[PDB]
C-alpha cells in the first residue's frame, strides 16, 4: 500500500530523531513553535516538489554526476521558495533568515532524494517526501513548544502576524504571569532539549516493546 510509507516515515524512521539528520534547522530555528511550524511547512513543500521532480527525471541522471545534477534540481526549487516567501510571507522570512536558504544542504532532503527517489515511482516518492516532511514538522513543533514554554510560558506566540490572522486561534498561554527561564532560548537550551527528547523516545520505545511482548 502506498500509504505505508507515509505512516512509517513519521516515527519508525524520523529524519531528525532516528536518522540523525537535519539537525541545523532543528536546533537553530526553534526558539518558538511558530518558527518551527513555518520551517517544517517550507521543508515539507520543498521535499514534495523535489521528490516529484527527481522521480520524474529518474531515468536520465548520469551515475557519476548524480549529485551536481540533483543538487541543481533542488537548488533552483529552494531559490524559488525563498523568492516566494520573501515576497508574500516577509514576516516569516525575516525570522528564519538564512536557514530558509539553507535547505539545499539539508541532509534529509538530499538523503531522501538519493536513497528513495532514484528507485521508486513518482507516487511513492511523493508520499515518502510528505511523510518525512510531516515527521520533521512534528519534531520541530514539539521542540519549539517545549523551549517556548520554558522561556516565556506562552505557546505559539505571534502566529497571527507570521502565519496569518486565520491561525490566531493557536495563540494559547501556559503558566500565566511567568518571566521564564532565559537559558531555553539560548543555544545551550537546544542541545539539552534535543537530548532529553531522544532519551524519552528511547524509553517509550522500550516500554512499547515490553507492552507488545
Amino acid at each position: 500500500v502506498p500509504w505505508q510509507y507515509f505512516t512509517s516515515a513519521l516515527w519508525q524512521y524520523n529524519v531528525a530523531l532516528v536518522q540523525m539528520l537535519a539537525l541545523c534547522p532543528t536546533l537553530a530555528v526553534t526558539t518558538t513553535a511558530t518558527n518551527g511550524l513555518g520551517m517544517g511547512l517550507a521543508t515539507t513543500l520543498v521535499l514534495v516538489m523535489t521528490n516529484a521532480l527527481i522521480s520524474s527525471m529518474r531515468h536520465t541522471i548520469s551515475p557519476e554526476v548524480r549529485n551536481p545534477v540533483m543538487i541543481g534540481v533542488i537548488a533552483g526549487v529552494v531559490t524559488l521558495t525563498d523568492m516566494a516567501m520573501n515576497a508574500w510571507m516577509h514576516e516569516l522570512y525575516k525570522v528564519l533568515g538564512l536557514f530558509i536558504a539553507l535547505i539545499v544542504t539539508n541532509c534529509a532532503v538530499l538523503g531522501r532524494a538519493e536513497s528513495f527517489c532514484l528507485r521508486n515511482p513518482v507516487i511513492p516518492s511523493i508520499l515518502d517526501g510528505a511523510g518525512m516532511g510531516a515527521g520533521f514538522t512534528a519534531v520541530l513543533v514539539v521542540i519549539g513548544g517545549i523551549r517556548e514554554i520554558l522561556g516565556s510560558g506562552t505557546l505559539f506566540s505571534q502566529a497571527s502576524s507570521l502565519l496569518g490572522s486565520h491561525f490566531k486561534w493557536m495563540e494559547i498561554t501556559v503558566i500565566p504571569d511567568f518571566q521564564g527561564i532565559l537559558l531555553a532560548i539560548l543555544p545551550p537550551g537546544a542541545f539539552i532539549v534535543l537530548g532529553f527528547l531522544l532519551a524519552a523516545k528511547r524509553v517509550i520505545d522500550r516500554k512499547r516493546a515490553e507492552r507488545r511482548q
Partner: protein, 189 residues
Amino acid sequence: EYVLFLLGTVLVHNVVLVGFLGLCPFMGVSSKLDPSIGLAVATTLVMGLGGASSWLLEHYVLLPLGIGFIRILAYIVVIAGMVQLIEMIIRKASPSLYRSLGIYLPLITTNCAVLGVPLLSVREGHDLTMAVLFGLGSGLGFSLIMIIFAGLRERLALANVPAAFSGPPIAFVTAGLLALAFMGFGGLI
C-alpha cells in the same frame, strides 16, 4: 588586524556552538578521535577552497552580469564539483593519502557549513583575503570543536552512563554544556 579576526571566528563566533552549521557529520563521526581529525583537516581545506571559489564567482561573474539571486545554486554546484575532483585526484595520485583526506571527503559535499560560510561572508562584503580567512577560521573552529567533542565522547564511552542515556543523547547534553562553557568568550573580540 587579522589575528583578532581569526580568533573571533574560532572562539567568539564558533560555526557550531553559536552558528549551528555542519552538525550532522559533526555528531555522526565524533565517536572516534582519528576519523574526527581526518574530517577536521578535510573540512578545513574544503571550506577554504570553497570560500575562495565562491568569492571569485560572485565578484567576477554574478554581480557584473547582474544575476545575484542565482548565487546559491551556482555556489553549491561549483563546490560540489570541486569536492569530487579533490576526491578522485587523491584516489589515484597518492593512494596512501586516500586514508586521511580522501575517505572523509564525501561526507562534506553538502555540509551546510561549506555553504553557510560563503552566504554569511557575502552579507559582510568581504574582499578575497577576508573571504579566505573567514573560511579558514570557520574550518579551524569546526576542527577544534570536533576534536574536543571526540575526546569527550571517547572518554564517556568507557563511563557508567545510564542505559537510557548512553550514546547520542549524552553526546547532545555534553555538546550543550560545551556551548555553555564556550559562552564565556562572548564580547571578548
